[PDB]
Every structure is written in C-alpha cells, then in structure tokens.
Design a protein around this ligand. Structure first.
Ligand SMILES: CC(C)(COP(=O)(O)OP(=O)(O)OC[C@H]1O[C@@H](n2cnc3c(N)ncnc32)[C@H](O)[C@@H]1OP(=O)(O)O)[C@@H](O)C(=O)NCCC(=O)NCCSC(=O)C[C@@](O)(CC(=O)O)C(=O)O
Ligand SMILES: [Mg+2]
Lengths: 616, 402, 90, 78, 78, 90
C-alpha cells in the first residue's frame, strides 16, 4: 500500500555505529513478536565486520559494511535507512541512499543541516517517490511494527504507552521529544497511536506534516488524525488548505505551539531552526485561528490536548466508527545487568583481590599512596619497589640498597645464559620483547635465580643452630649444591668486587649483619676445598636481604618467613638483569649482526645404534 | 537559524564574490564601518577614497531620517560625532546607535528592486522597477530558465544587464549560504550595476561549508540588545557537540528561570508561563537536548544558576527543570550535571529564596529523579520532583500559583 | 567445552576420533574450521614430521639447550627456544 | 605517546646525540624497553600479591564467552 | 619457503577455500604456526637430551667474543 | 666482564657507583653508551617510577596474575605478562 511507511516486514540499515540505537530497535522487534530483526546490516564507514547484540536474552550477530552500495547489494530487501551521520555528512549519505533503487525511506537524525541541502533532499525524495523523515528528528514509529532508531525511548516507556500494539490515531509533530510525550498523552486518552512521525524542527524539512497526514487519511486502520505544530514557516497552512478542500475527512486534532511569542521580543529565535515567526501568518495565533476556522479540533492550550483527543476518540467509539479491541498480552524483556547494578537491585562478587595498586580513581595509588606523593617525597625506584612488592614505605637506606642491587646486577657480560639467549634471539631478527623473554627464561637455579634458595638455606642452617662446617657437611651428604656458592669465572684468584660492594654497603648502613657473618664462615670452608666455591652475587643478595629485613624494624618474624617461603628475591635479579639484556639486544641490532647457528665442531653427534632403538 | 548581517558585510561579500559569476566588476568594495571604539584616523589611512569622494553615512544595526546623502569627509565626521551613542526608539525598542556604514554617493535616476528568498520547491527571485516572481527549482537550477522574459514596460537597453545581474545574484545566493537577500534599491553606473541598500540573512548551518567566504564577517546582535558573555559561552559549548545547548536572556531581573529539555517542550513551557500572565517574569528562553554529557549539562546549569543569584528578589525566585519523556537523552547523566551545579550554588540558592520544580521522563529517569530527591533532602532549598505520571507542564501552575 | 561433549569446530571429539581424522584433521578443524580432504590433512602431518627437528645448532634448539643446561624446567626451556622463531629462523 | 615524544625532545636538546644517533635510536626501537623494564616492577608485584593471597586457579567464566560454532555445512565446503 | 608456497597451492586447488579465505589466511599469518608446532617436538627432545646427559651450565667462551668498549671521549659527547 | 673489574661501556662499576650515576646513569651506559647529563638520567628514572604499575586489569598484569593463580613460578608468570607488550598495550 502507498499509504504504509513501515510494517512488520520492514527491513532497515543503520548508518553509523550507534550501538544503543541498534539495541533499542532490536528490543522493540522482540517485544512486538517479530520473527526476525528489523535491521539487515549496519553501515560503519570506519570498519567492515560484525556487531554482537541481544535478541531478548540471546546474542545475535549483525553484519557491518563500509559503504551504502555494498550493504544494499547484500541486503536488497532493506528499504529503510536510519541515518546517524553528522550534519557534515548527512546530505551526501542521504543522497547516496536515495540513489539506491532498493532504498525508499531515509530518516535523517542530524541537527545543523543547511536549509539548501534539506531543500535538495526533499525535492530528490519527491522526484523519486521516496520519503525523507528529518533532518533534526528522532524519526517515528508504527506501533507494533517498526521503530526508527531511538524513537519512543526505553522498553519500559514502550510498555507504559502500549506502543507494542497499534491504535486508531495517526500522529505527526515537528518536535522529537514532544512526539514521545504525545505517545503517552494519546495512549491515556484513546486506544493509542497507529503510527507517529516527527518531521523535525528545520524550516525546510525532507517531508512536510501534510505528506504523513495524507497517508493517514488513506489508511483504513486510522480513524483519527492528531498533530502538534509550532510557530515559524507555513507548513501548517498546507494542512488547513487540505482541510478546507475536503482532502482530510477524518477528525483532526491540532495544536500549534509558540503562543508566548507576541509577549516576548520579535528577535527571539526559538530552539528549532525553523521556530521563528518572520511574518504575522507564521505566528501560533494565526495558525491556531486558521485551524479552528478550517474545522479542526483545536484545544484552548497544550494542557487540554489529551482532553481533545479523549473527546474525538469517545465520539468515534459511540458512533461505531472505532471499535473497542481486547488488550493483547503485556510483553516482557530482561533488564540490562548494568541498569540493575546501578539501581542497586543486584550484587555480584569479585573474582580477584588487588592489594598493591589502584588505577580506578582520580589518581594512581601504589599500596594506597598517591603517585604524586611518591614522587614529591623522592621515594625513588627503591621506594616504588618497597610499596609494590612489600607494601611498606621502607627506610631510605633500605630503598637505596634495592637500587644498589639493581645497578650491581644490571649486566655481567654477553656470555651468561640470559644475555647469550637474548643475543641469539636478537641475531635471529626478533623484536626486543621476544628477545628479552628468551633470555629471562634462563633465570633459575644455576643462573641468577639462586637468590631465594640462598636466603632459604642459609637462614635455616643459622636458625636451626647448624655450625658452618655442619651445614657444608650436611648439604654434601644430601648431594645438594649450596645455593649462592660457586661461580663459572669468579673465584679466590679472581675475586668478585660486586660482592665486596654489597658487603661494604651493608656494613656501613645495616644495624646488623649476623647471617652475612655466618655465610662468610661457610665461604672460608668451601673455598678451602675449591677456589671457585666463593659466596657469589646471588648468595650475597639473598643473605644481605634477610639481614636487611631482620634489622630495619619494618618486618615481623612472620613477614620475613613469608618473604622467604614465597620467593621475592629472584625478582630483583630479573628486574636488574633486564637492563643488560635489553642493552645486549640493542647492541646486536646496532652491529647489524647476522643469524647465529652454533658451530658443528662444538657438538659431538652421538646417535644410538639401530640395535639400541629397537629394544631397551 | 537565519541570521542577519550588516549592510557593510553583505556589500563586501557582493564586491568580493559577485565578480566570479558576472563579468561586470564595476562595483568596487569602497566601504567603511564605524563602531564605538573605531579610530577615525586609522580608517582614514585604510580608506584614502573617503577624503576624495562624495559620501553616504547611515546606521548599520539591522534596520527614516537617519541616512545622510551627498556629503564631504568633514560633513561625514559631523554626522558621526553627533549621532554616535544616540538613544533612539525603533520598533518600540530603545537602544543606542553604535554602528555606521560610510560609502560613496552614487548619483542616480533609476531605482530597481531585487530579492531572493526560498520556498519548499526552490528559490524565488522578486523584481520590480508591479512585482514579478521567478521560481528556480532546487534540482534544475537557473540554467534551465530564460530570465530574459522579465518586465517589458521600461527595460530594453538594460534588460540584458538586469537579466545577467539577477542570474549572478542567484548563484551568489546559492553558493554563499544565504537564506535572504534584498537590494532595495539597485542602480546603473554607466554600463555597470551598483547596489544602494542591502539586507541579508545567512543560514548559520552553512558555516562548515563557508569558512573561506565568511572569513571576514561575524553575526551582529539585534538593535537594542548588548552581547552577553553567558550567552556566548553557551553558544561555545553548543558548537563542539552534536547535542543542543541554547540560551537567550529575556529579562535578567526575572523571577522565573527555566531549564527545559527539547526545542518543542521549551516553547510549551514558555506558552504556559505567558498564559498564566508571567511573561514579564520570564527571565530566559533556553533548551538542551540531543543527549548532552554530564559536563555539558553542568556548565549549562552553572550559567543559569550564576545569572539567577546575582540579584535578590523579594518573593523569591523559581527554577523550572522540565521536559518531555526523552527518547535517548540519559536523564541520570544529565541530572548528575544539574545536581553537581546545584550542590556548588547551595549557599547562593538559600540566600536568594530559590524554589526548584522538576518534571522529567526518559532513559534512566528513576535514577535521575532519585538524585534530585536525595539532593532536596540535604541542600536546604525546596525541590519538588515529578515524573511521567505528572502532566508535562503541571509544574508551571504549581510554581506560579500554588 | 561447555556441553556434555567437547566440540572442535562444532564436531564432537568422539566423531573426530571414530572417523580417524588424525592430527592433521584436528588442525583443519581448530585452525581453518574445515573438515579437510584426507590428502590435505596428511600434508599437514607430513610437514610436522619434516620440520620436527633440524639438529641442536639452530637458534631455537640452541636457546632451549642453554635454558635446559641452566637447570630450567621443560616449559620455560621450550618457550626460550620458540621465542627465536621469526624472520630469519623458522 | 608522552614518553616517546619527550624522549625525542630529550635526545634532540641534551647535546649528547647527533641527528644520526637520534635517527638510529628511532629506527631500531629502544623506547619500548623503558616500559618493559618499568612495568616489570608492577608485574612482579601482582604475581607476589596472588601468592600472598593464596589465590586459586582462574578459569574464565563461560557466561562471558559467546560459543558460536560453524554449521556442518560451513565446515564441509567454503 | 617450500611449506608456504605449497600451502598456497594446496588451499588454491583443494576446493575447500574461496579466494577471500585464502587471502585472509595469507594476511593473518597462519603458516608459521606449523613450524612452531612441528619444531616444538625437536625442542622438547633437545631439552630432555641435556637432562639425560646431566649437562652443566653453559657460559659462552670469552675467546668467541670481541669486547670493544667505547673510549671515555666517545661516552662523553656524540 | 672478562677483566679484574666489570665495565659498563668501558667505565668501571666502582666509578659508576662512586659517582652516583644511579639506575638512569647505568641505562645511559648500557643502552646508549653515553654518560648522560644528570637530568636526562633522572628523566629515565622518573619514567620507570611512573610506569611501574597501572593496576591489575591491563593485559600484562592480567596475564601475569593468571599464570601466578595457575601456581607458576615468578619468572614464567613475569614473561607471560611481558609477552602482551606490543602495539596496543605498552
Ligand atoms: C655456579 C655453578 C652453576 C657453577 O657450576 P659448574 O658447572 O662450574 O660446576 P658443577 O658441575 O656443578 O661442579 C663443580 C664441582 O664443584 C662442586 N660445587 C659446585 N658448585 C657447588 C655448590 N654450590 N655447592 C657445593 N659444591 C659445589 C661440585 O659438587 C663439583 O665438585 P666435585 O663433586 O668434587 O667433582 C654452581 O657452582 C652452582 O650451581 N652453584 C649454586 C647455584 C648458584 O648459586 N648460582 C648463582 C651463580 S651467580 C649468577 O648466576 C649471576 C652471574 O654472576 C653469573 C655469571 O656471571 O656467570 C651473573 O651476574 O650473570
Ligand atoms: Mg533537540
């Protein structure tokens, strides 16, 4: 039928990635008992792909296309386009959609579209027998069949205003917000709207109020016409002329807003672009008087609009023109979790706890302390580690010992396992992060990661009362190396000055070094056997950290036991040595190093015999 | 919105861009605008032609006994030194004269009228020497028309010159974003065309497409009213968003202030206030819509509250926060901005005896009305809160009668 | 994995095994979402066998050996070597 | 963006780098190393926090995953 | 090169992939996964071989590294 | 590392520490091979403190937490999170 704009079979494209509007349309389709969604595809100029949304409680996928012609070719059944383009692109996108043979209706939401562009869109629509609703409108809706984007708001409002089933009222306004208020007014004073359209408030619209009023006049389902206009322009005079020419025979309720204008200055431009009475004819008074004289049902003010609707509907009901129908079942829809959570209706437990930092407020917190206060107090990198790892604001000398360790272990040449693996990955053309992790993954019991075990084993020996000789003897009997003892290149003949530097700092600044004194006694015994069995840098860090925690006053015996048991201290070597690993990776990139392959002459290939692989 | 421009600006646009459509660049851009803080000697050094031509000086504040015809530069300074700051009543509005246009005097005999305005089907050109109307279709343009078929009565020698001039004027109208142009009258300078008076309106929605042609102009305030820092601040917020934030001060000393959502509903709230006989107490006309964020509604609410707390009024003051049931404007986010501003103006609200009346529906309205109800219980000012159950404009008689 | 039986691209693990799709057929489902022709699944299995090892000297095997000599567990040592796979090696 | 841009200004203005040295630093990618190094402090902290909390094994909740298997028809052809 | 090229021929000729599907496979980078998966067999084998051999910690020999430190003059300016 | 004392870009570790070059000065030597002006070494240290942590929700912290909840050692958990550092995160 030519008079029908939208029906329950209407398929549409949504131009612009407006996820809320998309969900609102789908929610209406669901409560109206539609078999399939009213949206065939989304036109997203920035990206083609998929969009996930709800169909009641079930999630569905909507296809997303970059252009209007690509979407139209994929879904030729879609004849409506809900255009959310900005005022900067509303004209070219509407004109592109109007040039598509399969698109018949375009709803232009954008405010601020030039009057000339709207004139050209309106003329293009009239020439091609198409419809432009807008610009500067929410759209409109056919009750129980289709909604344009955000028209009629929340599903709660749709249910309260009974918009999931059609009535007998054909409604048209200029205002988008007043179209929703009118849906409420009409539902309370009649069987509700059949269809409602807001043409927008621009003085040159894509479609005039009369275009829609003439469709309502042809539609047999509509027995009552209602409209709400405003001052400025001569749109309402098209209706009054049609009313005088007997082109509108159905009873028409009409009200023109802007009665305030003569009381206020002539220069006042109202909200809508077209709401400014340039001539006397353009005023609300001249329009409401001409409406009264044409035979329309005009109320005393906007306050008695619903009462006039009630009077006209009741008249049709008594005369038999309109028939009373049974109210269909009230539809239901699940509430969005975010709404139920915001209103305090529901609670949901957290899966994780975080006690070391908080990024969720106005300012980042490290163990409850604002980053600003950490920096103003010059806590430094050692103080940041005190907060994030230990949840303590450490004494200055304890934060400086952490920084001293980082500098001392930053690098120990390219030959060590971690630096060697990071260099091989860098020579293989790997990025910095992959190369770094390739080297960090060698940190363990033999290379670097002996700190936790040195702290653990020396603390146990000294605490359980073992004499240094008994500890050395016990570990040998178990076949277990003493962690923190031994080195590949450092020895009695080649002393490790890093160990000396850590020991001088602890002697000058720690209130006590009892575990260090015990460790040095163990070292005298091990080096007496083999010169390479020195207290290495990992053993030195672990042992000194126990003395630091024991003597600084900031840790209880339980806290120290927890630190030892959980393994914090290897983190210091990983963090410090990452400086040298990144340096070695960058050095190989600057050198333009080639791919490494280990020389064959350094590998003894010793394959098993055929006999060996056949049995045991 | 259609915005009027100074005769100075319209003639300068015609002098600059009309010679691109017409090959008769006979009309030079000899124009001088005189404002309140305009140094005469600077304009004299900028326009040497002033001292060596016969002049015309008239007020350019969008308007008689005020046009000074055929004068010397000395005689022009006499008119300027006398009429500047003069209190005059035009159309019932009493304002001071502050802007004047100085241009060369063109001695003439003929006086022809030309005007371009638009309708729903295209543009209409009006001409007189009673008045002929020529319609230019939106899709077809001027090229499809034989403009030549115009008045035979007296045109002949210059019928082709007027045909060419009004065809170029339509192109100028169409490409420069005009909503209205009127040259009443225009004349001939030998074989050239000269405009004598010019009235023009630009469609302000064209701004994005007219950055180069409109570069030298700004929209003036209507006669009588002075520019408002608060109004220009709201226009500044409105320009950086797709949402709508509009504010017009009607009476600074008014008792009734409004913060209504929507173009449609705001007009209806003003209609109700006027219908109750409180037009004089209507302090402003404003609107917000198109889902503005919390920060935008906060700055808007702050500006209305600031203007409302400057003067203390004996019967108190009323703030009407109304609107229809919204389609997409988030009532929780917008009212969060409104509540934040009301919290800041707490002391100034109690001291000015201000009463707040609210009626709103739309997305998350229950959460938004809850914010207003919780605020009214701690602010110390009366806040009457209503939802979609109350008739839209029922808070107006409740505040002005009850 | 959320139902009564594990599905690989919609196909029950039982049917994958009963049909003897093999490791190549599992990769066809999990990576390509296709039930590939048999010769295409066998070409995937042929590639896996052909590239299984190319001696201890290559970057990935070399780094995995260094991490294993440093007393690292299997997973850390494996990732140490896999992280060398890039434009020059593999 | 702030770190990368400021580091270019630092190198350009401190006098210690030639235009060539700055070009080499930019081309080779040094600056992401600063984030890896710095953020390792917080990563180690988060790891230790979960060990102190005695946290259990995590498994992502099924209700946060839309399982959308292809049809038999989809896996048989293209 | 042989695996990548042959896989394109396999996808092009087996009938199971459209031109678009093949373009997506090439653009996204599936095929390096085959080498990671296959070579993991030999990597795990080499790791286990060193554990069975009781291999000691490796440190790259100094005689295979040319240590070429910059001068004091080089580190002070550009 | 092959002599009597460790050198960072030719400078003895003892002289690096006696001169209080700090962590920023060590990075200047090892990454840039420069003895940087003090304010340039302090800007490096300022960056390290500013990016130290940004909560548990970011990709790297999230992956490191998941590996730690799975009972992984510190190094494996750290690398699990560092491997998310790329074009979108960090
Ligand atoms: C360091 C090394 C793997 C060396 O291994 P090797 O392969 O040379 O020796 P092995 O084959 O294990 O044995 C040789 C003979 O001495 C005996 N023997 C050896 N260690 C013994 C011991 N701890 N306790 C008792 N006895 C021992 C053994 O029982 C056998 O004697 P015997 O039975 O009579 O035949 C080894 O000592 C060891 O695991 N230490 C404990 C782990 C440890 O603390 N790691 C941290 C080192 S600091 C670091 O990683 C940072 C670094 O400084 C690194 C760098 O620069 O290199 C940097 O900053 O990068
Ligand atoms: Mg609006």
């Amino acid at each position: 039928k030519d008079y029908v704009l939208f029906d329950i079979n209407t398929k549409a494209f949504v131009y612009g990635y407006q996820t809320n509007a998309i969900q609102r349309m789908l929610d209406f389709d669901y409560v109206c008992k539609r078999s399939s969604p009213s949206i065939s595809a989304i036109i997203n100029p920035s990206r083609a792909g998929i969009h996930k949304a709800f169909w009641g409680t079930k999630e569905i996928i909507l296809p997303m296309y970059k252009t209007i012609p690509l979407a139209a070719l994929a879904y030729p059944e879609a004849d409506v386009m809900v255009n959310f383009a900005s005022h900067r692109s509303a004209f070219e996108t509407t004109m592109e959609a109007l040039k598509e043979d399969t698109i018949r209706i375009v709803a232009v939401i954008a405010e601020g579209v030039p009057e000339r562009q709207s004139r050209v869109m309106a003329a293009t629509a009239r020439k091609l027998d198409k419809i432009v609703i807008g610009p500067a409108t929410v759209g409109g809706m056919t009750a129980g069949a289709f909604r344009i984007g955000n028209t009629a708001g929340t599903i709660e409002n749709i249910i309260a205003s009974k918009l999931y089933r059609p009535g007998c009222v054909g409604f048209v306004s200029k205002s988008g917000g007043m179209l929703n208020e009118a849906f409420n007014i009409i539902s309370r004073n009649s069987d509700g709207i059949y269809e409602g359209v807001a043409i927008g408030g621009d003085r040159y619209p894509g479609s005039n109020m009369l275009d829609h009023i003439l469709r309502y006049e042809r539609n047999p389902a509509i027995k009552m016409i209602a409209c709400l206009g405003e001052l400025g322009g001569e749109d309402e005079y098209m209706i009054i002329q049609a009313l005088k020419e007997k082109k509108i025979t159905k009873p028409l309720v009409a009200w023109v807003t802007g009665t305030c204008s003569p009381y206020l200055p002539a220069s006042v431009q109202f909200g809508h672009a077209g709401a400014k009475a340039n001539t006397e004819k353009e005023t609300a008074q001249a329009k409401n008087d001409a409406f009264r004289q044409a035979g329309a049902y005009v109320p005393r003010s906007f306050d008695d609009y619903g009462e006039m609707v009630r009077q006209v509907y009741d008249m049709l009901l008594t005369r038999g023109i309109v028939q009373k129908f049974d109210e269909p079942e009230v539809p239901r829809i699940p509430t969005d979790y975010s709404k139920a959570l915001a209103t305090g209706d529901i609670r949901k437990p957290t899966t994780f706890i975080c006690t070391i930092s908080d990024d969720s407020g106005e300012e980042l917190l490290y163990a409850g302390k604002k980053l600003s206060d950490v920096l103003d107090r010059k806590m430094g990198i050692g103080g940041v580690i005190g907060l994030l790892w230990f949840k303590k604001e450490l004494p200055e000398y304890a934060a400086h010992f952490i920084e001293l360790v980082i500098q001392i272990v930053a690098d120990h040449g390219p030959a060590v396992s971690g630096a060697h693996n990071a260099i091989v990955a860098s020579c293989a053309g790997k990025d910095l992060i992959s190369s770094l992790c390739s080297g960090l993954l060698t940190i363990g019991p033999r290379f670097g990661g002996a700190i936790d075990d040195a702290a653990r084993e020396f603390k146990r020996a000294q605490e359980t009362g073992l004499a240094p000789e008994q500890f050395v003897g016990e570990m040998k009997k178990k076949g277990i190396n003493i962690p923190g003892i031994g080195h590949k290149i450092k020895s009695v003949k080649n002393p490790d000055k890093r160990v000396q530097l850590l020991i001088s700092y602890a002697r000058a600044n720690f209130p006590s070094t009892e575990l260090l004194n015990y460790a040095l006694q163990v070292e005298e015994l091990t080096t007496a056997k083999k010169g390479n069995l020195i207290l290495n840098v990992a053993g030195c860090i672990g042992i000194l950290f126990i003395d630091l925690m024991s003597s600084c006053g900031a840790f209880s015996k339980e806290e120290i036991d927890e630190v030892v048991r959980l393994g914090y201290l290897n983190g210091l070597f990983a963090l410090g040595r990452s400086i040298g690993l990144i340096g070695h990776i960058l050095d190989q990139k600057r050198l333009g190093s080639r791919l490494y392959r280990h020389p064959a002459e350094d590998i003894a290939y010793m394959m098993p015999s055929e006999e060996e692989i056949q049995c045991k | 919105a259609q915005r009027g421009i100074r005769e100075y600006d319209a003639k300068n646009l015609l002098a600059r861009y009309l010679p691109e459509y017409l090959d008769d660049f006979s009309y030079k851009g000899n124009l001088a605008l005189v404002g309140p803080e305009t140094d005469i000697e600077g304009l004299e050094a900028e326009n040497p032609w002033l001292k060596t031509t016969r002049l015309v000086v008239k007020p350019d504040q969008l308007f008689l006994g005020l046009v000074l015809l055929d004068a010397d530069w000395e005689e022009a300074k006499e008119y300027l030194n006398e009429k500047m700051g003069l209190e005059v009543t035009i159309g019932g509005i009493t304002g001071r004269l502050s802007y004047f246009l100085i241009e060369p005097f063109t001695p003439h005999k003929e006086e022809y009228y030309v005007a371009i305005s638009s309708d729903y089907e295209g543009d209409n050109i009006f001409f007189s020497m009673k008045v002929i109307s020529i319609h230019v279709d939106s899709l077809e343009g001027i090229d499809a028309l034989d403009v030549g078929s115009k008045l035979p009565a007296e045109l002949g020698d210059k019928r082709a010159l007027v045909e060419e001039f009004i065809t170029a004027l339509w192109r100028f109208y169409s490409d420069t974003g005009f909503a209205y142009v009127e040259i009443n009258p225009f004349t001939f300078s030998g074989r050239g065309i000269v405009p004598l008076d010019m009235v023009a309106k630009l469609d302000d929605a064209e701004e994005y497409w007219q950055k180069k042609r409109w570069s030298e102009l700004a929209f003036p305030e209507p006669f009588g009213r002075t520019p408002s820092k608060e109004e220009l601040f709201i226009k500044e917020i409105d320009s950086k968003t797709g949402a709508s934030l509009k504010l017009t001060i009607l009476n600074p000393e008014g008792r009734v202030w409004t913060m209504v959502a929507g173009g449609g509903a705001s007009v209806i709230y003003a209609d109700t206030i006027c219908d109750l006989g409180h037009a004089d107490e209507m302090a402003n006309y404003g609107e917000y819509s198109g889902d503005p964020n919390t920060e935008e509604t906060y700055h808007y609410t702050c500006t209305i509250l600031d203007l409302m707390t400057r003067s203390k009024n004996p019967n108190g003051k009323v703030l009407l926060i109304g609107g229809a049931i919204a389609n997409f404007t988030d009532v929780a986010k917008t009212f969060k901005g409104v509540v934040m501003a009301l919290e800041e103006y707490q002391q100034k609200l109690q001291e000015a005896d201000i009463e707040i009346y609210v009626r709103r529906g739309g997305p998350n309205y229950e959460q938004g009305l809850k914010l207003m109800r919780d605020l009214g219980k701690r602010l110390g000012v009366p806040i009457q809160v209503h939802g979609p159950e109350t008739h839209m404009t029922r808070i107006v008689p409740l505040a002005l009668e009850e």
